[PDB]
Design a protein around this ligand. Structure first.
Ligand SMILES: Nc1ncnc2c1ncn2[C@@H]1O[C@H](COP(=O)(O)OP(=O)(O)O)[C@@H](O)[C@H]1O
Ligand SMILES: Nc1ncnc2c1ncn2[C@@H]1O[C@H](COP(=O)(O)OP(=O)(O)O)[C@@H](O)[C@H]1O
Lengths: 359, 359
């Protein structure tokens, strides 16, 4: 039936960015953007991502991708548009102070008292400061990218679930009855986030080693400022936002295929946080007293706690964003836990390659 | 709950254009575009509209609106974008030749033989030529407008039915279960096309005299060119397109509230055309033999024939596009049978007024 040169599945930060770069790299190549949710999609990972760009999230060898992504952020993708991005130093609080060029927490939080009251200076005396860290809303980044892509002639299909079939895509909708509709495509970019691996598996039998982890983002209602630095401890992050802090748990491991997030087992009372997060908090309460006061919103059940599924490339919690061609014309785009520092770069790199194999 | 300064209901040619002009006139005023179909929507009137701009469709006093709309068309709304628009003269074939500055069909179709074989020069000797007529695809116009509006920060909501409530809008969706969601709005533009009058009636008890007519656009598979002029006879139009002609029936009157298009009663055989169109054809077959040959696609039932509902302002088949504020902050935007010559103008006029009352 109808056909497109390029079909991008997924309108989150990754797919939206990739569709944008492809519209500027290959404007003569028709592109269709398919998203099963809306635009934006508050049921996705991109919306809850803390949006922290930090030199501490750059794996060895990825300095080029990290800086290019940073430049894009401050330049709003070079679209003459507005993208709220503030300069906010990031501190990696540490116990026994001894090693590389660290900084005494006492001095680091000199003009930031609202961040001091959260911890215990004695149990976290030193830190690794990153003066170039930045904060932004991934949701705004993604929307901006989608908008610009659409303003550039990108086909748009929302509230549509894409299914991969040999040669093209099958689109499912709802009018009440289903509406299946196939379409040919020369190139298909799978930017379904954490759902990307399964998509290609159940659709084309293409096996991968990628995994997925469910991460919650409970809020900490304690005084915060527009310039109060991002803080990290034992892998946990305190992202100042909306006058408070958003707690970004560490991912210790991938979650199994058959797993339903439940959480709730704190000192004899059922909460909305997973057992693992609960344990982490208990282990950080002394160092970060704020985790033991009235600030943290624990909720009653997992339903009251903001959460999302993030892809884990290769199943590694610390693996960066990446792309790969699993078959002729078929690419799998993965963002992941480091997408805030390396996300755009991986979408642009994929766009360049796709654009070339078309010229 | 959540609120917007401006909410535009309907993403067809009218709503899409209005949302575009509002984004440029009042960029600082948030705007949400709601459409129950997709983008584009091939289930709307805009998609089937012949897109004919002709000085013969300008009612007295509407010359300013007509020319402004024409300028927008050739300039693609001034968006530096591409909008296919060709120069195509329009001929209003007439019987007894005698009156204003007419032109002998024989000379008018001098270099256009493929248009001559459709009629009988004797029964239609003279015509009223319009050298400034233009043809374009309303669908492309609308999409372009929506795209540009989105690239300008216009909120977008598709596959969502809007319902007017005191103060704001109620949004219905489908995930399988319904999802009602209200939103406050300072200004609400009702660009639901033919469904606009009922919308406000069943939602706010606001009575109007506007009507609706169902018009079909059967195709005539006979030789056509990129420069073959648009032809009209006894109110019927032959719009050259895709190597053929699209038949644009005349609207003699409005269709009643409880009316289901059926059609099909030609010389003892059931077809897909309404009785009225059938009669018109019979009355034009002599003058336009092409209507009696193998060219016309009659179909078996109305389901096989391209059709759409068009609003009739004031219930008058020949009334132009218009807007009105039926209540504080509530506007009803109507396109209609003359939207190809006056549509943009009415959407821009409404945008200016809405923008001013906000400033
Ligand atoms: N099979 C599917 N068909 C269409 N769209 C999909 C499908 N599965 C997921 N999506 C969309 O893919 C998008 C990616 O969002 P997200 O998880 O944030 O990706 P990422 O974080 O990698 O940018 C999601 O927003 C989701 O709405
Ligand atoms: N109540 C509704 N809620 C949301 N969208 C609507 C509703 N009713 C109609 N629409 C949309 O309003 C749009 C107008 O399309 P159209 O009929 O071509 O308007 P017009 O011809 O005046 O530009 C339609 O495309 C339709 O999809």
């Amino acid at each position: 039936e109808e056909a497109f040169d390029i079909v991008v599945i997924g309108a989150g930060r990754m797919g939206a960015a990739c569709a944008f770069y492809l519209r500027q790299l290959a404007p003569g190549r028709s592109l269709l953007l398919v998203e099963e949710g809306g635009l934006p999609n508050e049921e996705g990972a991109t919306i809850l991502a803390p949006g922290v760009w930090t030199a501490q999230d750059i794996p060895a060898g990825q300095e080029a991708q990290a800086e290019w992504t940073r430049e894009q952020l401050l330049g709003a993708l070079g679209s003459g548009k507005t993208l709220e991005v503030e300069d906010r130093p990031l501190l990696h609080l540490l116990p026994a102070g001894e090693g590389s060029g660290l900084t005494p927490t006492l001095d680091a939080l000199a003009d930031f008292p609202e961040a001091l009251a959260l911890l215990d200076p004695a149990r976290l005396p030193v830190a690794r400061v990153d003066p170039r860290a930045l904060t932004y809303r991934p949701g705004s980044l993604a929307l901006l990218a989608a908008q610009q892509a659409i303003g550039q002639g990108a086909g748009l299909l929302l509230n549509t679930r894409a299914e991969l079939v040999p040669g093209g895509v099958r689109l499912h909708r709802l009018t009440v009855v289903h509406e299946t509709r196939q379409i040919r495509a020369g190139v298909i970019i799978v930017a379904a986030g954490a759902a990307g691996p399964a998509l290609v598996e159940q659709g084309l039998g293409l096996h991968t080693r990628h995994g997925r982890a469910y991460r919650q983002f409970p809020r900490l209602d304690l005084l915060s400022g527009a310039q109060t630095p991002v803080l990290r401890a034992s892998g946990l992050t305190l992202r100042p936002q909306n006058g408070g802090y958003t707690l970004v748990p560490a991912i210790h491991h991938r979650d199994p295929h058959g797993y339903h997030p439940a959480g709730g087992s704190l000192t004899g009372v059922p909460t909305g946080l997973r057992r693992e997060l609960l344990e982490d908090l208990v282990g950080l309460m002394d160092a970060v007293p704020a985790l033991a006061g009235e600030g943290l919103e624990l909720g009653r059940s997992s339903a009251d706690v903001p959460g999302a599924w993030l892809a884990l490339p290769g199943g590694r919690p610390d693996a960066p964003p990446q792309a790969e061609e699993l078959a002729p014309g078929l690419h799998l785009l993965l963002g992941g836990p480091l997408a805030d520092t390396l996300g755009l770069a991986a979408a642009h790199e994929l766009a360049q390659r796709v654009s070339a194999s078309l010229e």
